[PDB]
Amino acid sequence: TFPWLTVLWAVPVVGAAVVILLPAAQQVLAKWLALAVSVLTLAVTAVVAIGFDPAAAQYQFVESHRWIPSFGTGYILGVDGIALALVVLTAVLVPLLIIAGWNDASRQTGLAGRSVQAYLALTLAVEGMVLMSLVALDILLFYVFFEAMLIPMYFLIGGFGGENRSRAAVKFLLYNLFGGLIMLAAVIGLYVVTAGSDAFAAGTFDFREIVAAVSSGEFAVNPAIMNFLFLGFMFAFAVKAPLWPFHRWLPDAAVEATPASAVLMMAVMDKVGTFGMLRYCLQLFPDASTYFRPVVITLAAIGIVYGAVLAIGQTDVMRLIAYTSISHFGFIILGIFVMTSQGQSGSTLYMINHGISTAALFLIAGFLVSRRGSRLIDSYGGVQKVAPVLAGTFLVAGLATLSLPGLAPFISEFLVLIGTFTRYPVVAVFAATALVLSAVYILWTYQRMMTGPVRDGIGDGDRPVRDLVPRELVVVAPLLALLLVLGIYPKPALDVINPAVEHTLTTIGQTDPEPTV
Amino acid sequence: WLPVWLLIALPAAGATILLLAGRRSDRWGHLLGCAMSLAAFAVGTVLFAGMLGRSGEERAVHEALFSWVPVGGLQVDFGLQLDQLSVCFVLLITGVGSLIHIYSIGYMAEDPDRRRFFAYLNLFLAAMLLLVLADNYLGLYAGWEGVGLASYLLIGFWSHKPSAATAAKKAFVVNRVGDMGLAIALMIMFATIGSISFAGVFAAAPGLSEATLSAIGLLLLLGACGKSAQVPLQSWLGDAMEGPTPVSALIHAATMVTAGVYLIVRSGPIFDLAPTAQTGVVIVGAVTLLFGAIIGCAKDDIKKALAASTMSQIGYMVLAAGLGPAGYAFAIMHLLTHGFFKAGLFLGAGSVMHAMNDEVNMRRYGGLRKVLPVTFATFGLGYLAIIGVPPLAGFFSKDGIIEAALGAGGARGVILGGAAILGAGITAFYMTRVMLMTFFGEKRWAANSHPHEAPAVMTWPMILLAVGSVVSGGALAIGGTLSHWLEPVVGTHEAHHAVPVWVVTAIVLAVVAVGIAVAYRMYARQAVPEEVPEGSALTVAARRDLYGDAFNEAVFMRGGQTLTAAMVTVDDKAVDGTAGGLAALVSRTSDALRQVQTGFARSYALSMLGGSALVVAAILAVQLW
Numbered sequence A: 001t002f003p004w005l006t007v008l009w010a011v012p013v014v015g016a017a018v019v020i021l022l023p024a025a026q027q028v029l030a031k032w033l034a035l036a037v038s039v040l041t042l043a044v045t046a047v048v049a050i051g052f053d054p055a056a057a058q059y060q061f062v063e064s065h066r067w068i069p070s071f072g073t074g075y076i077l078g079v080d081g082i083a084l085a086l087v088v089l090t091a092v093l094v095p096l097l098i099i100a101g102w103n104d105a106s107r108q109t110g111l112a113g114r115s116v117q118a119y120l121a122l123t124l125a126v127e128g129m130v131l132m133s134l135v136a137l138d139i140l141l142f143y144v145f146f147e148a149m150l151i152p153m154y155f156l157i158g159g160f161g162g163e164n165r166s167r168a169a170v171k172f173l174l175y176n177l178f179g180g181l182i183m184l185a186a187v188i189g190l191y192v193v194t195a196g197s198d199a200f201a202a203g204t205f206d207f208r209e210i211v212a213a214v215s216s217g218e219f220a221v222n223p224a225i226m227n228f229l230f231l232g233f234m235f236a237f238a239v240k241a242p243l244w245p246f247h248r249w250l251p252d253a254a255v256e257a258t259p260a261s262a263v264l265m266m267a268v269m270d271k272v273g274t275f276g277m278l279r280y281c282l283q284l285f286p287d288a289s290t291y292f293r294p295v296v297i298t299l300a301a302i303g304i305v306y307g308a309v310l311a312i313g314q315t316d317v318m319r320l321i322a323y324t325s326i327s328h329f330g331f332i333i334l335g336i337f338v339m340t341s342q343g344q345s346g347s348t349l350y351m352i353n354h355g356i357s358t359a360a361l362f363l364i365a366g367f368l369v370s371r372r373g374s375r376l377i378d379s380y381g382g383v384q385k386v387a388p389v390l391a392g393t394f395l396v397a398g399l400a401t402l403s404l405p406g407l408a409p410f411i412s413e414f415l416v417l418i419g420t421f422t423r424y425p426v427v428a429v430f431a432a433t434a435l436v437l438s439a440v441y442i443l444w445t446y447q448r449m450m451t452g453p454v455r456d457g458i459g460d461g462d463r464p465v466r467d468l469v470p471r472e473l474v475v476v477a478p479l480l481a482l483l484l485v486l487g488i489y490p491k492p493a494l495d496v497i498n499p500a501v502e503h504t505l506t507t508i509g510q511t512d513p514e515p516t517v
Numbered sequence B: 001w002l003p004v005w006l007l008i009a010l011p012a013a014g015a016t017i018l019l020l021a022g023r024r025s026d027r028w029g030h031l032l033g034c035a036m037s038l039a040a041f042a043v044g045t046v047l048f049a050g051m052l053g054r055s056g057e058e059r060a061v062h063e064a065l066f067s068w069v070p071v072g073g074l075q076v077d078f079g080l081q082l083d084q085l086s087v088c089f090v091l092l093i094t095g096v097g098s099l100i101h102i103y104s105i106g107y108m109a110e111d112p113d114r115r116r117f118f119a120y121l122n123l124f125l126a127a128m129l130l131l132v133l134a135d136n137y138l139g140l141y142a143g144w145e146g147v148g149l150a151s152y153l154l155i156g157f158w159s160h161k162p163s164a165a166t167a168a169k170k171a172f173v174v175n176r177v178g179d180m181g182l183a184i185a186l187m188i189m190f191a192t193i194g195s196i197s198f199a200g201v202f203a204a205a206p207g208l209s210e211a212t213l214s215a216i217g218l219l220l221l222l223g224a225c226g227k228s229a230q231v232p233l234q235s236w237l238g239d240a241m242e243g244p245t246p247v248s249a250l251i252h253a254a255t256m257v258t259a260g261v262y263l264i265v266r267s268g269p270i271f272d273l274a275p276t277a278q279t280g281v282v283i284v285g286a287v288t289l290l291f292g293a294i295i296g297c298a299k300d301d302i303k304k305a306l307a308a309s310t311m312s313q314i315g316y317m318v319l320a321a322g323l324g325p326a327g328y329a330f331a332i333m334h335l336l337t338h339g340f341f342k343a344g345l346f347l348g349a350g351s352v353m354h355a356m357n358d359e360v361n362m363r364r365y366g367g368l369r370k371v372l373p374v375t376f377a378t379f380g381l382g383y384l385a386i387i388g389v390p391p392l393a394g395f396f397s398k399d400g401i402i403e404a405a406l407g408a409g410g411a412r413g414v415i416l417g418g419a420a421i422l423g424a425g426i427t428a429f430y431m432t433r434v435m436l437m438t439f440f441g442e443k444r445w446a447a448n449s450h451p452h453e454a455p456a457v458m459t460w461p462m463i464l465l466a467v468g469s470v471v472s473g474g475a476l477a478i479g480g481t482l483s484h485w486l487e488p489v490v491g492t493h494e495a496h497h498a499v500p501v502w503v504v505t506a507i508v509l510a511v512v513a514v515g516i517a518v519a520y521r522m523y524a525r526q527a528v529p530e531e532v533p534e535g536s537a538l539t540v541a542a543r544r545d546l547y548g549d550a551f552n553e554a555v556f557m558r559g560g561q562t563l564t565a566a567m568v569t570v571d572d573k574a575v576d577g578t579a580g581g582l583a584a585l586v587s588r589t590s591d592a593l594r595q596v597q598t599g600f601a602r603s604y605a606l607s608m609l610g611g612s613a614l615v616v617a618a619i620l621a622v623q624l625w
């Protein structure tokens, strides 16, 4: 059996090294090679998904090797439905981001002319680390790459991006790294607890073994210690996936970074936080997660509503999209921690759908912002007349983020809301208010920017808003097609997701409550 | 055979092409849209005949296309239930939409982007067909939100006009509040019953409780208020007239507003077991009927007056549906008659506006009867239908609805009947107002307008709409054909003969005549003034749309903006404030500690001799801490 996951995560990294090592004069060849590497990673992901059997064992394509036995951590890769979903999302998105940021790094000077090569290599490295984290079945390996993938994105923000790129990058890296270090505390605590338990030959980081031990009850732990470890993991993932109120880093980073990098952050990278929640926080600390479920459920619902309200209140398009993404992550976490088959399956499908939808919306907004020179909502008007295709695609992406049933995200949001009510009715209604709030902050922005008289300098002047160029269409059309497909026919995704989620529930002793009737 | 799903797949594909083909098909796209709407009508007719060719339970068609959301116990399967209730809406939607498409061929002929407009029309038709055809509430919600989107797009047409964009945004937001209510309904349904399909829900309907069933019914009623544009979610109709007249015709006559009535009737099995929900439905219907009639009395623009009339008629629908099985069939019949005559009225108004250089203020109108004979004739036919004159279609349907309302019995019966009678009288009054101000009296035209007769392409749909507004009433009402046809799906209440039908038929006619006389005295006997006259506080209130939009602005827009500002302040000062304070504390501590690095070797030596701290700590560790 070929080491499919090893190749999957290594190809982006090796390609990044090659691209950065390319001569400065090979900028165009560097772009094409980076795109080829991303497409090769996508092909690897495709073969993995096709070979994946959702009815088979929980983890497939499992590769195991001794990496650092001294730390009780091994190079253990393996993909389940949850991990496979995010792997597919990342693999499909990254090529689209590359062709979206095709010319983003052209304006940067210095750096020995490696600006384009540096940008592409950083993007590929982020892809590789994200994939490796998703496929990792070892707690310490997962944490290694979860914390590692910050620095390439830190460079990708601070390098390139807007005027405030420095401050935005610092806030990004410091929030996420404070969370990651708080994780490290809990990871070392977990190692200590496992070593102090007879259930394992020594301190262990093998995720599958620890999960089996905790589920079987052999690895009993003092509830306080498990609670603290769960709190550390949760804080780390909450800063990573912008769970309210730990979200405050995301808006600045998203606005300041280039649109492609911002999408890579929110659409792909931040999903790792929610995935880490769903997998580790639940399967390692089922008791602690159950105990804290009310608190984090309340936090996620507050995040949903609060992010929607702020998005309504934002005067900046990109910041508005960032807060929309925060609210959607609130949905994701709410669906994860309601511990219901509907809830968790919907949260995973929402990871996918929000990734694609935010990618589309943020990239279209970035194209529009690039046409002009300001991100202000009031800076635009009547853009439909000048750029019918740009405005139409923006409308479609907004409707996706608005959770129309004709588009994928609704199927997910609905699924989450359903799952929420079976356990927490009031929280479910409070979240459902975000259905109206999304209509508000999407359609009001569309009215402000796309409708009305063509504002000065939009259809004329030195910086007119020309319609989407063919490359931007290449970026957009696949995303809109994916949204439509996953809205109309989500089953292919759910068939993959539903088994894994069931296993997760089966592992944590949770089951969807039976109907009252 | 012809699969039922083609009805949904027919227009949608059209829209898809018209949306993707772009300028490549701008020259002929409208032809494809109209052809596809006509094909949908043909398929609907064939399926209706097939249902007629079947008997009993075999009449209804159930077709599950595929498993759609197989998540755990949800197991929602995409399916269509084209039954006796569904087929009526299918025919109404397809036929009126095809007529409106043909009318738009000419109405939008002199406007660019006609292909995109017809793409939106096809998407609208597909969405509403999915709404009425889905056999489960999740597909119903899919069609519901698709119809919301289509209404936003069509109202939002002519986006260069800010009023149109604002109207589209308001319409979508209100309809999304309704959709939120419907989503809570579905969510409670799954929580309690564990199923979303009509069959499973209605089989488990007897269980649950009066409280739970009433909650479901009230949420569905909120959804209907959204789509049906009943209070408190009615304010969005007025501004929606900023869009092209065919859009208003499709939204009001059939489809958009029809969605709420369809939802109530389809959920009728739930409402029958939830009398409190039925009471809420009745209250909403009566209140919105009265409010719409009052607003229509004052509206000066023909579009606004017709929108108010549609609101009142949909209030009649909601009232009849809330009456239960005694009114469900009457609700549906009056809904079909309303589709016919209201579509005719809207198309006539659009023809008038096109002839009047896009003018919408009825003050500029006058004496249009002679100069616009065919449109005047069609508009008058629809006017008689909505008025409810015996020969006209709307007569029998409105009479049946009023009879059911007054037969509700007791205080409920008397109050509902009185509300319906007052609504009918006020309907007579304001429709007479519109007619007199439009087609009679002095010309009152401005800017040397040159009204011309509507083209054949627009005229023929108007004539067919008038024919429907003349026939449909007797066709369905007389003989109880609609009642018998809906009896299978809709529970048959039979009758109670609360009052001698003739007394109600006479009372309605008398109220209509009183309203007609009042309007003739005000606007026919007395010359129509060209300027807004001052009047009682009620007059200005109705002119301000009953100050309903102002209520939304003061409570939700203003309250919403206050909440948004508060949350922005919390984010900037409180949430970010904690991190800023932590960073400031670290910086202050860093500066303080760096001040310790005095640079004097002797100060460092003093700090080292602070190793007395180490010595005392080591010693005290033996002295019990």
Ligand SMILES: CCCCCCCCCCC(=O)OC[C@H](COP(=O)(O)O[C@H]1[C@H](O[C@H]2O[C@H](CO)[C@@H](O)[C@H](O)[C@@H]2O)[C@H](O)[C@@H](O)[C@H](O)[C@@H]1O[C@@H]1O[C@H](COC(=O)CCCCCCCCCC)[C@@H](O)[C@H](O)[C@@H]1O)OC(=O)CCCCCCC
Pocket (backbone or CB within 6 Å): A312, A433, A436, A440, A444, A447, B161, B162, B163, B164, B165, B166, B167, B169, B170, B173, B174, B177, B232, B233, B235, B549, B550, B552, B553, B556, B557, B559, B560, B561, B564
């Ligand atoms: C259970 C939860 C229920 C909560 C639902 C509330 C939804 C939000 C309401 C406000 C809105 O939905 O959004 C308005 C503004 C921008 O409003 P706008 O500026 O876009 O439009 C203005 C217009 O200005 C434009 O319109 C004109 C005409 O074209 C152009 O001439 C101008 O140049 C310019 O273009 C003009 O100048 C201004 O004076 C006007 O006030 C225009 O607004 C006006 O709002 C009024 C109310 O609002 C509505 O929705 C009505 C429906 C509300 C739904 C609930 C109804 C009751 C339900 C009971 C169960 C209406 O009369 C029209 O809706 C009209 O449109 O957003 C915001 O601050 C949002 C701030 C926070 C919102 C979050 C709420 C929690």
